[PDB]
Design an enzyme around this catalytic site. Structure first.
Site, PDB file in Angstrom:
ATOM      1  N   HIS A   1      10.859   9.053  13.010  1.00 15.75           N
ATOM      2  CA  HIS A   1      11.323   7.776  12.497  1.00 15.75           C
ATOM      3  C   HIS A   1      12.388   7.918  11.419  1.00 15.75           C
ATOM      4  O   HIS A   1      12.441   7.014  10.590  1.00 15.75           O
ATOM      5  CB  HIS A   1      10.143   6.939  12.006  1.00 15.75           C
ATOM      6  CG  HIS A   1       9.238   6.457  13.108  1.00 15.75           C
ATOM      7  ND1 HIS A   1       9.401   5.289  13.806  1.00 15.75           N
ATOM      8  CD2 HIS A   1       8.119   7.024  13.628  1.00 15.75           C
ATOM      9  CE1 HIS A   1       8.450   5.158  14.708  1.00 15.75           C
ATOM     10  NE2 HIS A   1       7.667   6.197  14.603  1.00 15.75           N
TER      11      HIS A   1
ATOM     12  N   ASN B   1       4.271   0.193  16.110  1.00 13.72           N
ATOM     13  CA  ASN B   1       5.401   0.375  16.992  1.00 13.72           C
ATOM     14  C   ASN B   1       5.564  -0.831  17.888  1.00 13.72           C
ATOM     15  O   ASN B   1       4.869  -1.821  17.685  1.00 13.72           O
ATOM     16  CB  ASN B   1       5.230   1.584  17.906  1.00 13.72           C
ATOM     17  CG  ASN B   1       5.435   2.887  17.186  1.00 13.72           C
ATOM     18  OD1 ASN B   1       6.002   2.931  16.089  1.00 13.72           O
ATOM     19  ND2 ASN B   1       4.983   3.981  17.753  1.00 13.72           N
TER      20      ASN B   1
ATOM     21  N   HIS C   1       2.290   4.191   4.848  1.00 11.52           N
ATOM     22  CA  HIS C   1       1.130   4.969   5.256  1.00 11.52           C
ATOM     23  C   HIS C   1       0.031   4.072   5.814  1.00 11.52           C
ATOM     24  O   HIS C   1      -0.453   3.164   5.157  1.00 11.52           O
ATOM     25  CB  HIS C   1       0.620   5.745   4.047  1.00 11.52           C
ATOM     26  CG  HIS C   1      -0.454   6.750   4.302  1.00 11.52           C
ATOM     27  ND1 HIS C   1      -0.810   7.219   5.525  1.00 11.52           N
ATOM     28  CD2 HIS C   1      -1.249   7.440   3.448  1.00 11.52           C
ATOM     29  CE1 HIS C   1      -1.762   8.105   5.448  1.00 11.52           C
ATOM     30  NE2 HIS C   1      -2.063   8.241   4.185  1.00 11.52           N
TER      31      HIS C   1
ATOM     32  N   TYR D   1       0.654  11.177   6.468  1.00  7.20           N
ATOM     33  CA  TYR D   1       1.671  10.411   5.759  1.00  7.20           C
ATOM     34  C   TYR D   1       1.720  10.826   4.299  1.00  7.20           C
ATOM     35  O   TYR D   1       2.764  11.002   3.714  1.00  7.20           O
ATOM     36  CB  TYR D   1       1.512   8.892   5.936  1.00  7.20           C
ATOM     37  CG  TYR D   1       1.763   8.414   7.346  1.00  7.20           C
ATOM     38  CD1 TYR D   1       2.892   7.662   7.641  1.00  7.20           C
ATOM     39  CD2 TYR D   1       0.906   8.764   8.389  1.00  7.20           C
ATOM     40  CE1 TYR D   1       3.139   7.269   8.951  1.00  7.20           C
ATOM     41  CE2 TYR D   1       1.157   8.352   9.686  1.00  7.20           C
ATOM     42  CZ  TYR D   1       2.265   7.596   9.963  1.00  7.20           C
ATOM     43  OH  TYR D   1       2.509   7.172  11.219  1.00  7.20           O
TER      44      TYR D   1
HETATM   45  C1  HEM Z   1      -0.073   4.898  17.159  1.00 10.98           C
HETATM   46  C2  HEM Z   1       0.433   5.973  16.597  1.00 10.98           C
HETATM   47  C3  HEM Z   1       1.587   5.967  15.590  1.00 10.98           C
HETATM   48  C4  HEM Z   1       2.357   4.968  15.180  1.00 10.98           C
HETATM   49  C5  HEM Z   1       2.335   3.472  15.601  1.00 10.98           C
HETATM   50  C6  HEM Z   1       3.296   5.513  14.222  1.00 10.98           C
HETATM   51  C7  HEM Z   1       4.283   4.817  13.559  1.00 10.98           C
HETATM   52  C8  HEM Z   1       5.140   5.278  12.592  1.00 10.98           C
HETATM   53  C9  HEM Z   1       6.236   4.560  11.993  1.00 10.98           C
HETATM   54  C10 HEM Z   1       6.620   3.114  12.341  1.00 10.98           C
HETATM   55  C11 HEM Z   1       6.815   5.382  11.113  1.00 10.98           C
HETATM   56  C12 HEM Z   1       8.025   5.098  10.196  1.00 10.98           C
HETATM   57  C13 HEM Z   1       7.683   4.614   8.762  1.00 10.98           C
HETATM   58  C14 HEM Z   1       8.915   4.216   7.973  1.00 10.98           C
HETATM   59  O1  HEM Z   1       9.661   3.355   8.501  1.00 10.98           O
HETATM   60  O2  HEM Z   1       9.064   4.797   6.878  1.00 10.98           O
HETATM   61  C15 HEM Z   1       6.090   6.641  11.152  1.00 10.98           C
HETATM   62  C16 HEM Z   1       6.353   7.762  10.418  1.00 10.98           C
HETATM   63  C17 HEM Z   1       5.622   8.928  10.396  1.00 10.98           C
HETATM   64  N1  HEM Z   1       4.589   9.230  11.252  1.00 10.98           N
HETATM   65 FE1  HEM Z   1       3.687   7.960  12.513  1.00 10.98          FE
HETATM   66  N2  HEM Z   1       3.048   6.843  14.057  1.00 10.98           N
HETATM   67  C18 HEM Z   1       2.000   7.163  14.904  1.00 10.98           C
HETATM   68  C19 HEM Z   1       1.443   8.418  15.065  1.00 10.98           C
HETATM   69  C20 HEM Z   1       1.607   9.450  14.177  1.00 10.98           C
HETATM   70  C21 HEM Z   1       0.799  10.633  14.098  1.00 10.98           C
HETATM   71  C22 HEM Z   1      -0.382  10.941  15.044  1.00 10.98           C
HETATM   72  C23 HEM Z   1       1.249  11.373  13.091  1.00 10.98           C
HETATM   73  C24 HEM Z   1       0.759  12.747  12.575  1.00 10.98           C
HETATM   74  C25 HEM Z   1      -0.553  13.038  12.716  1.00 10.98           C
HETATM   75  C26 HEM Z   1       2.361  10.672  12.503  1.00 10.98           C
HETATM   76  C27 HEM Z   1       3.093  11.160  11.452  1.00 10.98           C
HETATM   77  C28 HEM Z   1       4.131  10.474  10.881  1.00 10.98           C
HETATM   78  C29 HEM Z   1       4.907  10.952   9.747  1.00 10.98           C
HETATM   79  C30 HEM Z   1       4.672  12.307   9.054  1.00 10.98           C
HETATM   80  C31 HEM Z   1       5.803  10.018   9.470  1.00 10.98           C
HETATM   81  C32 HEM Z   1       6.878  10.021   8.368  1.00 10.98           C
HETATM   82  C33 HEM Z   1       6.476   9.235   7.134  1.00 10.98           C
HETATM   83  C34 HEM Z   1       7.258   9.530   5.891  1.00 10.98           C
HETATM   84  O3  HEM Z   1       8.037  10.510   5.820  1.00 10.98           O
HETATM   85  O4  HEM Z   1       7.023   8.713   4.974  1.00 10.98           O
HETATM   86  N3  HEM Z   1       2.563   9.496  13.186  1.00 10.98           N
HETATM   87  N4  HEM Z   1       5.063   6.550  12.060  1.00 10.98           N
END
Ligand code: HEM
Ligand code: HEM
EC number: 1.11.1.6
Lengths: 727, 727
Positions: free
Chosen positions: B102, B175, B366, B389
Site C-alpha cells: 500500500h 479494501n 492499524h 502494523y
Molecule cells: C484482509 C486483509 C488485509 C487488508 C484489508 C489490508 C489492508 C491494508 C491497507 C488498506 C493498508 C494501507 C494503510 C494506509 O493507507 O496507510 C495496509 C497496509 C499494511 N498491511 Fe495490510 N491488509 C490486509 C492484510 C495484511 C496482512 C495479513 C499483513 C501482515 C500480516 C498486512 C500488513 C500490512 C502492513 C505491514 C502494512 C503497512 C502499514 C504501515 O506501514 O503503516 N496486511 N493494509
C-alpha cells in the site's frame, strides 16, 4: 513439494537467448561463466537455495510454513510463534528510504579497459595500462520519479559508474546531458523541489509538466540550457544503451610530475544515439513502465552487451580563460568543435545482478570518491555535491558502514582507524584505533604521494579572494548555449523541442508562467519562441520580436555533435521487430524475414490475436509471443507483415491499430504480398512512399530495404503525413 | 524579485471551484472555514509563510539563498557555510521508507456520524449518538506498487479510515473487495513477494501480470476468489469515490450487557459503483499516473465530497456455524442475500491535507487500533495483522513515538507510563513512570470496564484446542465463492473478467503456469475456463471438461449485490465531460450544454488543438483547459461536440481520434449540427445508434439523452461494435 514441471521448462537456459525466449533470471544463474574480480569477490555473500531445508534466520528448520501457531485449528494465534514473528518482522522491515533524487534506476555489472596508457596526463592506476581491467557496476536512471515510477518519462537520465580500481573506488556520477540546470549546489533543493511532485498533493509523479518547475525555470534563466536538452528528444531515450553520458563538471587529471590538466568526461554509446518520440514515450509509460529496465536486462541476457567509449575533453591549465564561458560553470558545455573528445577506453556491461535490492537498491555512488590521478575543481555545483552524497547515505543506508555492503566494497585493500557504527561487519584486530600509535608500530601507515600507489594529495591550486556568498560574473550568461544547442538540431528535432515546451507549458495551470517562459525563449531564438507561442495561443510583443539574439559560442553557429541524428550513427544489433501473424503464414516469407533479422542481431516477436500457436502454410508450427494488444508497437522498432491468409487479421482492429501507431511514431513498416491490403489502413499510395517497404514476397531486397530503414531509426520524412492520422 | 503577477492570478480563489478552474492548493488555504476537531488540533503545527523572513531551522535570517560561501567568487566552498550544510542536510534526509504494501495512496480529512445510536449492539462511543460527530482521516491506496507507481493499474484498492473518537483512535483498515487472497497471516510475505516486482530485476511495477503471481495463485487455490474480483472491473475503479469498501474479517460488537455480535464492515459509495475498462485504465497509467489522486483532490475542492455509508452485516453469536463456509475465513464473503447490510452512518470527506508528506505519508493505520465496544475474532489473517502494523511502524516512522506525529495523534486524552524513545515530543511531568506507584498516588489509573468511558476488557471467548500449526478443515473449500461471484456478474462483466485473465496470463512466460491456472478455472466454471483457454490457445482435456462445478453457497445461485452494474446506481454529479471546441463555437449550443451540465453537477473541460483562447460566434472568449492530446478522452466521462466552424476540427487527427478512443471505451458521445459529420470517424450508423446523442443543435432534449446515458456510466450495448475499430 516438487512443483516444477517434469520437463524442466520452469528453468531458463544458462546461455545467451533473445528477448522473450526464456524466463529472465538472476545474473549468476543466467551466465555463470561471465566473471570479473568484483563479481568473484561477491561469492562470499551469494546464497543458493536448491536442495536446502527452509529455515529461520537462526538456522532452525521449518516444518510448516503455511500456518501460524494457534490454540485449536480455529483458535487464536499464539505469541510464542517465533517462526511467524521473525517471518513477518523481516517482511515488515524490508524497505529502506529511496534515493532523494534518481530513485528510479536500473543497473548492471561490466568491465572497463583503457586503449593505451594515459600515464603522461594522469597517474590514475586504472588508466595506466591497456591490459589493466577494471570491474564496473553502472546504474542508469531518471531524476525526478520515485523508485516505482516509469522508465520512459521525459527527463534527464543519470549515468553512474562504480570503478573498482586497484587504488580505490572511483565513481563517475554523470548524466546523459552535458550540462546541469543550476550553477551552485545551494539551490539544488530549490530546483529539485520545483521539479518533484508539488507539496500539497504529491502530483505529478515523474514529470516536469507542471507549474512549480516552469515557475522556477522562468525565474532562473540559468536553467534554460538543460531545459532545452530535456525538451528535446534527448529527454526520452530509446534505451540506456542509445544515449550519451557526461561528467558535466570540469575535473582535473594529475600526472606523476604533478601537472594538472582540465578534463570533462564523456561516454559514447557504441550502439549509437536513438530516442523515442513523445507520444510513444508517454504511451510506453502506461503500456510498460519498466521498458528501459527490461530492455537493459534482456540486452545483457541476449549478449547485446551495452558498450560505451570513455572520452576526455582535455584543456591545458593555461587555456582556462580562453572561452566565452567559464570552464567551471556546469550550465555551460564545451563544444566538441572547439575541444574534441579523445578516446580513452571501452566499458562493457555483460551481466545482470542476482538480487536487485541487494546490488542495485543499495549501490551507493559518490562523485567525491576519486583516486590519486584525479582531482576536483572549484565548480560550485560540484563543490556542494562532495558534501551531499556522503551525507544522504548515512540515512539511506542506515549508517557509516555502507561501504561494507557487498556491492559497495572496494576490491582493493582498505585499512584505517575508523571503528564501530551501526551494522559494523569488519572485526578489527589492530591493538590501536588511533594514530600516531606505538602499540601497533603506527600501522596502518600514511603513504607519500608518488607516481604509483602513493597517498592522495590535492593539487595546490592558488586560492585567493574574500569569504563571499557570490556568483561569479562569468557565470551570468544564460542564452548562448541554449541557442547553440537549438541551431545544431535537425529541423525535425527542432519541431520536437517546440512540441515538448508546448505540451509541457500546456500543463501549467497559471497562464502568466507560460508567458514568462515564452519571453525567455525569445531571448534564445525567435523562431523557437514564436512556434511555441503559437501553440499556446500567445502573441509575442513587438519588443520580444526585437530582442537581440545571444552571441555565438566562441564563433560557433552550430555543432553537429549536439544533435542525436544530424550525423548518422545508426546500429541495428539488439533492436526488435514485430511480426504480425495470420493463421496460414507463407512460411517462405517468415524464414527469409527471420534469417535476415538474426543475421544482423535484430530480434523478432511473433504476434497474433490470441496466445498459443498457429501453423504456417507448410505445416510449420509457429509459437506466439504475445497478442497485438499485449505487445504494442511502442515496444518494437519496426513492423513486418508477411503474406498468407491476410483476411484472418485484415479486419482485426488491433492488427490495424498496430500499424497506425507504428506509422504514427515513424517506425519502418514492411508489407509482404497480400499484407499490402493494410496500405489502405495507413493511407499509403499505390505507388508507395519512402519508409514503407512493400513487395510480392519477403525475398530479394525486401529485408535489406527494411534493414536500411532500421539503421536510420525512424522515417523522419513521414512527420507531415502523420500530422492528421487519427491514432 | 520573481514576484506574483500583478493581477493576483497566481493564487486560487478560496471557494469551491470545478476541476481545473484554479490552481489546486493546500486544504486550509483552499477551505479555511472547513473545520473539525482533528483539523483544528493540527493548528499547533501548521506553519504559514507569507510576510515572514527566510531562515535556517535555528531561526537565523538568511541574506543570500542563491549562493554557497566561497573563498572568492570562483573559489572553493568553505566548510564554515552552515547555511548551505543545514539546507543540503535536510534535503538529503527527506525520504523515509515507503509502506511495505500500500505505498501508493491518496488521503483526505472528513467526518463521520451515526444515523442512530447503536448502543443496543455496541458500547462503542462513536456509534452511540446521531449528533455526535467523529473526525476522520481516510487514505485510499493500491496494494502492490511503490509510492511513485500509477493509480489506475489493476489491483485491489486499500480503503483505510482513521476515526478520532472520544474513547480512542479506531482504525478501520479495509479494501475494496470483501475477501483477501490468503487465509493465514503466515503466508502474507509469500503472497506479497509473489505479486510484487520479481527479485532479480525488480519488474514489473504495480502489476500482477507476471509469472510469480500466477505461479503462486496456481499453487494456492484459496487465492482464486480474490483473484476473480481483481480480474473483473472491480480491479480498475473509475475513482476512489466510486468503489465499495469492506473490513473483510469478521470482528465483534460488544454491547454494555456484554453480548457479542459478529460483524462485517461495509462502506457504500454514495456516488455509486463504477469502473474503467482495461484499455482505458492501462493507457491512463501512462497519460496520467496520478488520476485517482487528482480526481479525489479536485472533487473535494469542488464541493463534490466523497460520501460513503458505513453498513454492518450482523450475525448473532449462535449463528457462527450456520453457513456453508467458515465465518472466520477471509477468502469467503457473506452474501448480502443471506445477511443484509444494515445502514449505520455516513462519512463525508470534505477537506484535503496541507502537506502530503506530513499528513498522508506519515499517517499510520492499524486494524488493531480498536476501542471499547469492538473486539476481534480468531480469523487467522486478522490475528497476524495485529502483530505487523505495530512492528512495521517503528522503522517506517523511526521509532515508537509515531502516535505523536501530528496526523496520528488522538484528539482525546492519552496518559500512561511509557517514556523516552526516538524523537519524544511529550514532556512528562509525572514523578512516577511505573505502576503501581505511591508517589503520584497511582495516577494515571486503570479504569474498570463498563458501558461508557470504561477500560478495554476483551470479550471472554472460550478457547479449546491443542497448540497446532494447522489450517481449519472448514477453510479448505476454494471454488464456490469464485463461482458465486462469476454467476452474479453481467455478461459484459463476465467478458471483462475473461479478458483480464487472458491478458494477464498471456504475460506469463512459462506456459505450464498458464495451463495450471486454466485448470483451476475449470474447477470454478467451465464456460469461464474455456473462454480463457480459447484466448490462450489452450484446449481443455476431457477430464477438465468433466470437473463437477462447486456447489451453490447456501442455495444461492447468484447475488446481484456482487456485480458493479446489474442493479443501476448511476450518479452523474462530479463527473466530467470533454467539450471539443472549434474556432467559431455556436454559443447557443454551448450555452445549453453548460446550463444542463451545471444543473446536474457535471463539470466541463473545454478542449482545442492549441492552448489559450477561442472566441465563440457572439464574442464570448473561451479559455482553453488543455489540448485534445493534452487531456485525452481517458480523463473524461463523455464527449460533447458543439457546432460552429466544424471545418476547423473536422480534419484534425487528435479530434477524430479523441472520439474513436471514447467510443471504444463505451462512453457517451453527443454531436450537434455539423459535429454529426464525425459520425463517420467512429464508422457506424446513420440513423444513429444507442449511445450517440445527435440533433440539429444542443437543446434540452439533446442534453437529457446525454445525461441519461452518463447516468448509466458506459454504453455496454456498444461492446460488439468496438473490436473492429482501429483505436
Ligand atoms: C484482509 C486483509 C488485509 C487488508 C484489508 C489490508 C489492508 C491494508 C491497507 C488498506 C493498508 C494501507 C494503510 C494506509 O493507507 O496507510 C495496509 C497496509 C499494511 N498491511 Fe495490510 N491488509 C490486509 C492484510 C495484511 C496482512 C495479513 C499483513 C501482515 C500480516 C498486512 C500488513 C500490512 C502492513 C505491514 C502494512 C503497512 C502499514 C504501515 O506501514 O503503516 N496486511 N493494509
Ligand atoms: C552535475 C550535476 C549532477 C549530476 C550529473 C548528478 C548525478 C546523479 C546521479 C547519476 C545520481 C544517482 C546515482 C545512483 O544511480 O545511485 C545522483 C544522486 C544523488 N545526487 Fe546527484 N547529480 C548532480 C548534482 C547534484 C547536486 C548539486 C546534489 C546536492 C548537492 C546532488 C545530490 C544527490 C544525492 C543526495 C543523490 C542520492 C545518492 C544516494 O542516495 O546514494 N546531486 N546524482
Amino acid at each position: 513439494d516438487s512443483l516444477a514441471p517434469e520437463d524442466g521448462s520452469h528453468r531458463p537456459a544458462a546461455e545467451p537467448t533473445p528477448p522473450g525466449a526464456q524466463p529472465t533470471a538472476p545474473g549468476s544463474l543466467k551466465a555463470p561463466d561471465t566473471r570479473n574480480e568484483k563479481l568473484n569477490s561477491l561469492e562470499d555473500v551469494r546464497k543458493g537455495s536448491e536442495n536446502y531445508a527452509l529455515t529461520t534466520n537462526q538456522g532452525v528448520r521449518i516444518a510448516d510454513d503455511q500456518n501460524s501457531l494457534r490454540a485449536g485449528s480455529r483458535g487464536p494465534t499464539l505469541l510464542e510463534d517465533f517462526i511467524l514473528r521473525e517471518k513477518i518482522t523481516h517482511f515488515d522491515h524490508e524497505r529502506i528510504p529511496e534515493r532523494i533524487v534518481h530513485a528510479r534506476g536500473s543497473a548492471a555489472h561490466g568491465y572497463f579497459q583503457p586503449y593505451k596508457s594515459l600515464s603522461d596526463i594522469t597517474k590514475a592506476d586504472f588508466l595506466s595500462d591497456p591490459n589493466k581491467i577494471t570491474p564496473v557496476f553502472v546504474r542508469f536512471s531518471t531524476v525526478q520519479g520515485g523508485a516505482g515510477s516509469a522508465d520512459t518519462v521525459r527527463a534527464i537520465r543519470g549515468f553512474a559508474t562504480k570503478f573498482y580500481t586497484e587504488e580505490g573506488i572511483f565513481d563517475l556520477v554523470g548524466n546523459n546531458t552535458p550540462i546541469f540546470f543550476i550553477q551552485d549546489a545551494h539551490k539544488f533543493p530549490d530546483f529539485v523541489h520545483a521539479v518533484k511532485p508539488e507539496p500539497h498533493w504529491a502530483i505529478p509523479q515523474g514529470q516536469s509538466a507542471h507549474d512549480t518547475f516552469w515557475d522556477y525555470v522562468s525565474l532562473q534563466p540559468e536553467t534554460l540550457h538543460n531545459v532545452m536538452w530535456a525538451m528535446s528528444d534527448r529527454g526520452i531515450p530509446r534505451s540506456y544503451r542509445t544515449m550519451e553520458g557526461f561528467g558535466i563538471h570540469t575535473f582535473r587529471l594529475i600526472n606523476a610530475e604533478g601537472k594538472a590538466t582540465f578534463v570533462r568526461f564523456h561516454w559514447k554509446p557504441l550502439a549509437g544515439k536513438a530516442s523515442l518520440v513523445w507520444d510513444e514515450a508517454q504511451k510506453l509509460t502506461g503500456r510498460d513502465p519498466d521498458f528501459h529496465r527490461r530492455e537493459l536486462w534482456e540486452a545483457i541476457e541476449a549478449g547485446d552487451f551495452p558498450e560505451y567509449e570513455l572520452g576526455f575533453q582535455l584543456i591545458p591549465e593555461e587555456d582556462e580563460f580562453k572561452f566565452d564561458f567559464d570552464l567551471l560553470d556546469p550550465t555551460k558545455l564545451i563544444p566538441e568543435e572547439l575541444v574534441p573528445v579523445q578516446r580513452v577506453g571501452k566499458m562493457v556491461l555483460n551481466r545482470n545482478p542476482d538480487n536487485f535490492f541487494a546490488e542495485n537498491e543499495q549501490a551507493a555512488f559518490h562523485p567525491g570518491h576519486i583516486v590519486p590521478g584525479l582531482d576536483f575543481t572549484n565548480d560550485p555545483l560540484l563543490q556542494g555535491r562532495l558534501f551531499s552524497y556522503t551525507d544522504t547515505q548515512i540515512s539511506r543506508l542506515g549508517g557509516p558502514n555502507f561501504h561494507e555492503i557487498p556491492i559497495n566494497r572496494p576490491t582493493c585493500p582498505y585499512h584505517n582507524f575508523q571503528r564501530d557504527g551501526m551494522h559494523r561487519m569488519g572485526i578489527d584486530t589492530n591493538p590501536a584505533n588511533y594514530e600516531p600509535n606505538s602499540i601497533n608500530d603506527n600501522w596502518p601507515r600514511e603513504t607519500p604521494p608518488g607516481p604509483k600507489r602513493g597517498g592522495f594529495e590535492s593539487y595546490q591550486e592558488r586560492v585567493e579572494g574574500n569569504k563571499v556568498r557570490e556568483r561569479s560574473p562569468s557565470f551570468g550568461e544564460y542564452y548562448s548555449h541554449p541557442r547553440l544547442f537549438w541551431l545544431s538540431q535537425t529541423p525535425f528535432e527542432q519541431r520536437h523541442i517546440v512540441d515538448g515546451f508546448s505540451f509541457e507549458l500546456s500543463k501549467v495551470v497559471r497562464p502568466y508562467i507560460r508567458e514568462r517562459v515564452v519571453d525567455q525563449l525569445a531571448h534564445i531564438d525567435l523562431t523557437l519562441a514564436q512556434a511555441v507561442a503559437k501553440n499556446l495561443g500567445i502573441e509575442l510583443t513587438d519588443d520580444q520580436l526585437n530582442i537581440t539574439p545571444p552571441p555565438d559560442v566562441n564563433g560557433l553557429k552550430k555543432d553537429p555533435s549536439l544533435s542525436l541524428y544530424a550525423i548518422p550513427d545508426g546500429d541495428v544489433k539488439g533492436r526488435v521487430v514485430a511480426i504480425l501473424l495470420n493463421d496460414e503464414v507463407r512460411s517462405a516469407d517468415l524464414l527469409a524475414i527471420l534469417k535476415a533479422l538474426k543475421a544482423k542481431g535484430v530480434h523478432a516477436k511473433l504476434l497474433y490475436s490470441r496466445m498459443g500457436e498457429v501453423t504456417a502454410d507448410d505445416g510449420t508450427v509457429l509459437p506466439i509471443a504475445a497478442t497485438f494488444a499485449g505487445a504494442p508497437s511502442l515496444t518494437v522498432d519496426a513492423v513486418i507483415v508477411p503474406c498468407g491468409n491476410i483476411a484472418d487479421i485484415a479486419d482485426n482492429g488491433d492488427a490495424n491499430y498496430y500499424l497506425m501507431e507504428a506509422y504514427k511514431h515513424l517506425k519502418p513498416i514492411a508489407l509482404a504480398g497480400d499484407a499490402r491490403k493494410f496500405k489502405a489502413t495507413i493511407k499509403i499510395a499505390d505507388q508507395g512512399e519512402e519508409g514503407i517497404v512493400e513487395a510480392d514476397s519477403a525475398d530479394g531486397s525486401f529485408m535489406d530495404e527494411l534493414l536500411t530503414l532500421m539503421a536510420a531509426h525512424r522515417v523522419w520524412s513521414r512527420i507531415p503525413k502523420i500530422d492528421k492520422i487519427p491514432a
